[PDB]
Amino acid sequence: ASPFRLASAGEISEVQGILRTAGLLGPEKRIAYLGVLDPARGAGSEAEDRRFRVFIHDVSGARPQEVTVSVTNGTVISAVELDTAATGELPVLEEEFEVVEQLLATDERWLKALAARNLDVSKVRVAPLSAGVFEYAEERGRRILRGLAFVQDFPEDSAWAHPVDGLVAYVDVVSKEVTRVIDTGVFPVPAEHGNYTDPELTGPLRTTQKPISITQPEGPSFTVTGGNHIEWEKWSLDVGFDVREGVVLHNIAFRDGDRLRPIINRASIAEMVVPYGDPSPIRSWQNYFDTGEYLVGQYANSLELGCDCLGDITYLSPVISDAFGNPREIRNGICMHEEDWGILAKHSDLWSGINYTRRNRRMVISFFTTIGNYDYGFYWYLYLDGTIEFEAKATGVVFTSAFPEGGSDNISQLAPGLGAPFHQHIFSARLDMAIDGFTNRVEEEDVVRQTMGPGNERGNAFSRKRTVLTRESEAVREADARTGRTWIISNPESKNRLNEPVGYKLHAHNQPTLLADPGSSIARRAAFATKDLWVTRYADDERYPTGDFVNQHSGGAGLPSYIAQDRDIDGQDIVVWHTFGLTHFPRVEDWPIMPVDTVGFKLRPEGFFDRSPVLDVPAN
Amino acid sequence: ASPFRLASAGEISEVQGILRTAGLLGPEKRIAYLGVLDPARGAGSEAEDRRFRVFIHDVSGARPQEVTVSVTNGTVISAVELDTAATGELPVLEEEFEVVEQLLATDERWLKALAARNLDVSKVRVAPLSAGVFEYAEERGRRILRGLAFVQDFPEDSAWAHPVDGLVAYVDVVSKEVTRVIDTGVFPVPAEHGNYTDPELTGPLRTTQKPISITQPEGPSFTVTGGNHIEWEKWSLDVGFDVREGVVLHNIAFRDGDRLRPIINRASIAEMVVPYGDPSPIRSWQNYFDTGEYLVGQYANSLELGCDCLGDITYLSPVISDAFGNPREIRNGICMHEEDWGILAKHSDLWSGINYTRRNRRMVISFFTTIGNYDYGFYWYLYLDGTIEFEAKATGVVFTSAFPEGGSDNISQLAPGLGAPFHQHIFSARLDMAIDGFTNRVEEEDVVRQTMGPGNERGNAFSRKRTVLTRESEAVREADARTGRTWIISNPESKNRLNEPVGYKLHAHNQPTLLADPGSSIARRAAFATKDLWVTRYADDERYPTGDFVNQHSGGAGLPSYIAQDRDIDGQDIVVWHTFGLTHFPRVEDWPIMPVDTVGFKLRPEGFFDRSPVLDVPAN
Ligand SMILES: [Cu+2]
Ligand SMILES: [Cu+2]
Ligand code: NA
Ligand code: NA
Ligand code: NA
Ligand code: NA
């Protein structure tokens, strides 16, 4: 009955039938995106209407459409034709990936390049990558993918070990034309294999690891009701899933005595960009928007008990649409479990004689996605003490190139002749805040150093200052780790028992933001990634920091255009957008498969409660 | 047989007998520090000599002594009288703590101050705190403690909830004189209790937490031999314990095929300082050097199975000396166990069809200490992939004051009338490096942004630069999170298979360093805390960043005097000293007992191995 429930197979089948009957889903049409729309603000009238947003692509060259459908009423609400040279192309379709390799295999220029290198076309895999927007005027309004080649010596070989450098092709996937083949010269194809399950490479497996058994003899402490509503240790939330964003958390609230207190209305990773820093023309166009261009949710893994998720695991299996509108279940795509998290609080008091120890735990909600060579885990954590944390885990196989004779300033060497270009992995968390309700404000908090002198005669004092961000034009902020800079989201109309506004503090990891030149194409298309924090006024249609149609969009969409409205954000319904990422200079230890590296952020209560919220935790 | 074995009770009893027979341990003497000396460089002659360093205090006013004893030979090696006005006082003795409250209870000025506040002297607890060096000329060469008062309403009451502000006393603990009593005015004593085990405050305990059972049915994967030598998943190390530093890690090495490769010769937390930022004269002198002044190892907790350490736990029970030279065992003072640590590496490959997942784990070595109101956990972690990490966990009860009517820029309000002064908790990790041997160097690595232009026509390139630190005078470095600054410790004479020097990268958390004015007493005495990284040339007697005798030392000892030697550190036996800490603006949620907060650092391999070192991990 909850309006935040997961999309059902029946809902998706109804959408398919509504689109078909309306004449919108002929044999030339493909669904490039389908997802449920969140309830509009002020849905306290019970008039629930399950609506779906659909992007429809046309493989014959006709204009695509954006369509909104009401499943409850069985009607098309709106249908708009899209001019993609203006507003951007639709996300990449899974079926277009195979098109690239097939088209190149019959192109005379591609075959000549492979022949010069003595490569059998049947062994050459082509990575189909998003195109971006660069200098090629003929690409405007066309759906382009770019292809880079890798050799697979046999069907189970890791092709990533054998990049074919000096060669790139561009393909129009609608007209099925190879537009350009660029060959800048022959590089040796690195010969060592990268097969991390081959005993020749692994050696004998260790026999020294004894099992660790994690069990819950009475079952888990959380409950799941209505399919996706979770209650755990005073937390309450709904777990959503969207094919673009992946796991989305709704209605995060904390039961403080008799009051259910809201904290975050909607939390998601709303974009992620992987820009490459190699100036070679073979790769200088390479930038993945995994969320906006590829849709990370549709490549979610099925997670295996004991391997991917260990302990007493509760799974959700979200349903998405395939390209024809058929429901597709991602079996065991979301893992939920609680974990012990060490000591929560401890004190041994000499004067009172009381020894006190309590243990901490966290609730984990996670999924994993695979896009080409990279695999990313998305982890949300809720802690007993009111802390909320996000962690991204990056693994998989690094993207490779040749390593040039005489070295490189922009590529690491991993093996003889094998390089890995420098790159970043940058995320945008969209936090639709609701600290004790929707009237919120953001303050920037810096440490303040004080000079020795009158009122500070021993030169020991230090302080802090808070600056309220009052309008969107002043709410684009940078990190400053040296001054301990954090941001506080507070509710000025809800006070704790000391008459201070209740709040939560955002702690960033203070990693570098986008490194590209500010005049570059990627800086324009991923403007969100150039700054650590943005605050906007909530609006229904401002969903993604990069805009709705990221693929081959010329730039400036999303956050830079939103904040030009210069809206009041001082005690209003606001959204925090936090940029955070990893800068990856690959090391030898990342090859042939990369150990996990992590980045994230957390929010901790700041006078939200009237005292510690974990005094009622028992001594187990 | 190992020279790095823990001190035994028999060794400490022999030291006592040697000191007594030599006439050095009469009834007026107290042992303020006793610890084993590490083997000198080049102990490959098997001529092992177990030597102990002892600081001997004299309660009658005679000069203290530093003494070195050989247990194996039964001899006093050296004994030097100390001029404490020059070189610093000895660490605080546990028995001097009680002296402060007892002396004040009979002092006319103290009793008048308590009478004005209608406080029963029998209910007033006095926190005995280190004195530092300030403006009082009569304190030079005397052992001073300063006392702050708290009311205990009944024997099990938390006195920290009831600070007596406006009042401080200074006590000479050798002559047993109260030198000064300062009363700046009457503040109301905050009346609310802070008793976190009282049902009136906790409410009914939760019944919702179901058990998490962590067991190892075949026992742990590590082995312990010779009392303190650990082998675990290719790691090899010795776990030491010193009464000043606590847990010390020796001889950290990694078994890479047939080679045992050294990484770190000695790792320890060699100082920790807690400076307070309240300019009130009642507290503006307040700075704890928990390691150097109090000795954190002697206040180590006995850790309880199931509460402090959960899982299959192996304990060590280190032995220390009491003030009379009797051995004292800290039962279950060190916990060791392995923990599951999520996904280690994962990839699902479209082209090869191979799905691959491996799990990570870490080895944990930890102890907890309690000094007055604060409790600190020290955690060392070893990971399968070669990562070494340290984490400090801070909990306990925050130090309190009155909250002034009309507010404060330097104190948080926690409860009606109850304040908590701003402060920091700053640690110094001393890392005696041995990356593949003792010839090491440090490079500072910054990200390099590049301008769009020739050779970078699309403005996407970025790079990095490394600067070798060649002499001690250039090896005092600051963090720069915006440029992704890290430090690499490498061995220029040991190369990986790509002919690059092997190395490890230090990743800092980039938290603020010491905030006090640089002209302050604390900035002079804790100079190490003003900079993030120091590199020195190894020397036997350069053990602590603050010098040997920190208590009431006037300043400048330790690292600033060491680096004035300006020694060669480019491919030499070097020591890295890393400053890291927490800046604590107390929140309401920290009261009445503080949930754990953490800070730390980690080191990751950087071309140390020829490929990923965890290819031989099995699929469990
Ligand atoms: Cu990467
Ligand atoms: Cu603190
Ligand atoms: Na456009
Ligand atoms: Na909001
Ligand atoms: Na002196
Ligand atoms: Na060294």
mmCIF file of N, CA and C in Angstrom, chain A residues 476-516:
data_model
loop_
_atom_site.group_PDB
_atom_site.id
_atom_site.type_symbol
_atom_site.label_atom_id
_atom_site.label_comp_id
_atom_site.label_asym_id
_atom_site.label_seq_id
_atom_site.Cartn_x
_atom_site.Cartn_y
_atom_site.Cartn_z
ATOM 1 N N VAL A 476 27.770 27.354 -3.656
ATOM 2 C CA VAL A 476 28.701 26.470 -4.341
ATOM 3 C C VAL A 476 30.016 26.564 -3.579
ATOM 4 N N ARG A 477 30.380 25.501 -2.858
ATOM 5 C CA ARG A 477 31.432 25.589 -1.854
ATOM 6 C C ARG A 477 32.562 24.612 -2.155
ATOM 7 N N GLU A 478 33.754 24.958 -1.686
ATOM 8 C CA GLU A 478 34.930 24.112 -1.794
ATOM 9 C C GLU A 478 35.354 23.614 -0.419
ATOM 10 N N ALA A 479 35.982 22.445 -0.418
ATOM 11 C CA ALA A 479 36.576 21.873 0.784
ATOM 12 C C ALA A 479 37.736 22.734 1.277
ATOM 13 N N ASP A 480 38.029 22.618 2.576
ATOM 14 C CA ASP A 480 39.263 23.198 3.116
ATOM 15 C C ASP A 480 39.653 22.339 4.317
ATOM 16 N N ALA A 481 40.422 21.287 4.048
ATOM 17 C CA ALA A 481 40.789 20.357 5.113
ATOM 18 C C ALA A 481 41.642 21.035 6.176
ATOM 19 N N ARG A 482 42.467 22.010 5.779
ATOM 20 C CA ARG A 482 43.366 22.641 6.739
ATOM 21 C C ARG A 482 42.599 23.408 7.808
ATOM 22 N N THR A 483 41.408 23.904 7.482
ATOM 23 C CA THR A 483 40.571 24.608 8.444
ATOM 24 C C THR A 483 39.461 23.718 8.991
ATOM 25 N N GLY A 484 39.566 22.403 8.788
ATOM 26 C CA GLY A 484 38.575 21.475 9.310
ATOM 27 C C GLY A 484 37.168 21.750 8.826
ATOM 28 N N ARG A 485 37.017 22.234 7.595
ATOM 29 C CA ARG A 485 35.707 22.680 7.126
ATOM 30 C C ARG A 485 34.707 21.528 7.032
ATOM 31 N N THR A 486 33.535 21.729 7.629
ATOM 32 C CA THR A 486 32.391 20.845 7.472
ATOM 33 C C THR A 486 31.159 21.691 7.150
ATOM 34 N N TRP A 487 30.045 21.024 6.853
ATOM 35 C CA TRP A 487 28.785 21.720 6.596
ATOM 36 C C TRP A 487 27.709 21.149 7.506
ATOM 37 N N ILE A 488 26.903 22.026 8.094
ATOM 38 C CA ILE A 488 25.851 21.623 9.018
ATOM 39 C C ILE A 488 24.516 21.896 8.352
ATOM 40 N N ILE A 489 23.656 20.886 8.315
ATOM 41 C CA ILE A 489 22.282 21.069 7.861
ATOM 42 C C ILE A 489 21.406 21.105 9.104
ATOM 43 N N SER A 490 20.718 22.221 9.322
ATOM 44 C CA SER A 490 19.953 22.386 10.543
ATOM 45 C C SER A 490 18.526 22.776 10.209
ATOM 46 N N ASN A 491 17.670 22.672 11.218
ATOM 47 C CA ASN A 491 16.297 23.151 11.110
ATOM 48 C C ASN A 491 16.140 24.326 12.058
ATOM 49 N N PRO A 492 16.061 25.568 11.561
ATOM 50 C CA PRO A 492 16.000 26.723 12.470
ATOM 51 C C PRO A 492 14.719 26.814 13.270
ATOM 52 N N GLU A 493 13.677 26.065 12.917
ATOM 53 C CA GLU A 493 12.427 26.111 13.659
ATOM 54 C C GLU A 493 12.230 24.912 14.573
ATOM 55 N N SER A 494 13.226 24.039 14.698
ATOM 56 C CA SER A 494 13.142 22.890 15.592
ATOM 57 C C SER A 494 14.361 22.924 16.499
ATOM 58 N N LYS A 495 14.144 23.120 17.798
ATOM 59 C CA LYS A 495 15.242 23.297 18.736
ATOM 60 C C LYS A 495 15.359 22.116 19.690
ATOM 61 N N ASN A 496 16.591 21.837 20.103
ATOM 62 C CA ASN A 496 16.817 20.829 21.124
ATOM 63 C C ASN A 496 16.543 21.444 22.495
ATOM 64 N N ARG A 497 16.754 20.660 23.553
ATOM 65 C CA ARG A 497 16.379 21.148 24.876
ATOM 66 C C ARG A 497 17.253 22.299 25.360
ATOM 67 N N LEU A 498 18.378 22.564 24.702
ATOM 68 C CA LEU A 498 19.208 23.718 25.020
ATOM 69 C C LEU A 498 18.860 24.931 24.174
ATOM 70 N N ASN A 499 17.748 24.872 23.440
ATOM 71 C CA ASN A 499 17.275 25.961 22.585
ATOM 72 C C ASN A 499 18.224 26.250 21.427
ATOM 73 N N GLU A 500 18.942 25.230 20.960
ATOM 74 C CA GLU A 500 19.746 25.344 19.757
ATOM 75 C C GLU A 500 19.079 24.590 18.612
ATOM 76 N N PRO A 501 19.211 25.071 17.377
ATOM 77 C CA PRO A 501 18.606 24.348 16.251
ATOM 78 C C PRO A 501 19.212 22.958 16.103
ATOM 79 N N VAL A 502 18.351 21.983 15.809
ATOM 80 C CA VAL A 502 18.817 20.616 15.618
ATOM 81 C C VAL A 502 19.559 20.528 14.293
ATOM 82 N N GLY A 503 20.534 19.634 14.222
ATOM 83 C CA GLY A 503 21.301 19.584 12.989
ATOM 84 C C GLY A 503 22.037 18.281 12.800
ATOM 85 N N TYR A 504 22.595 18.148 11.599
ATOM 86 C CA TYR A 504 23.471 17.050 11.214
ATOM 87 C C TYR A 504 24.677 17.647 10.510
ATOM 88 N N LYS A 505 25.861 17.087 10.763
ATOM 89 C CA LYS A 505 27.101 17.605 10.192
ATOM 90 C C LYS A 505 27.606 16.661 9.105
ATOM 91 N N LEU A 506 27.927 17.212 7.935
ATOM 92 C CA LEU A 506 28.482 16.435 6.831
ATOM 93 C C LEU A 506 30.003 16.476 6.910
ATOM 94 N N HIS A 507 30.622 15.296 7.000
ATOM 95 C CA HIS A 507 32.071 15.140 7.033
ATOM 96 C C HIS A 507 32.519 14.585 5.693
ATOM 97 N N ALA A 508 33.303 15.364 4.959
ATOM 98 C CA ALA A 508 33.815 14.932 3.669
ATOM 99 C C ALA A 508 35.204 14.319 3.827
ATOM 100 N N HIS A 509 35.606 13.536 2.822
ATOM 101 C CA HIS A 509 36.955 12.990 2.819
ATOM 102 C C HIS A 509 37.989 13.957 2.256
ATOM 103 N N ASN A 510 37.554 15.030 1.588
ATOM 104 C CA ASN A 510 38.429 16.119 1.137
ATOM 105 C C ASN A 510 39.444 15.645 0.096
ATOM 106 N N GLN A 511 39.006 14.748 -0.776
ATOM 107 C CA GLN A 511 39.809 14.290 -1.902
ATOM 108 C C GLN A 511 39.748 15.312 -3.029
ATOM 109 N N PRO A 512 40.699 15.277 -3.956
ATOM 110 C CA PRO A 512 40.674 16.254 -5.052
ATOM 111 C C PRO A 512 39.417 16.115 -5.895
ATOM 112 N N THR A 513 38.934 17.254 -6.399
ATOM 113 C CA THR A 513 37.808 17.281 -7.323
ATOM 114 C C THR A 513 38.339 17.185 -8.765
ATOM 115 N N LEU A 514 37.516 17.542 -9.746
ATOM 116 C CA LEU A 514 37.874 17.319 -11.144
ATOM 117 C C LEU A 514 39.161 18.051 -11.511
ATOM 118 N N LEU A 515 40.118 17.320 -12.097
ATOM 119 C CA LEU A 515 41.426 17.888 -12.393
ATOM 120 C C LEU A 515 41.517 18.537 -13.768
ATOM 121 N N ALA A 516 40.612 18.195 -14.685
ATOM 122 C CA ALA A 516 40.685 18.687 -16.057
ATOM 123 C C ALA A 516 40.683 20.216 -16.113
#
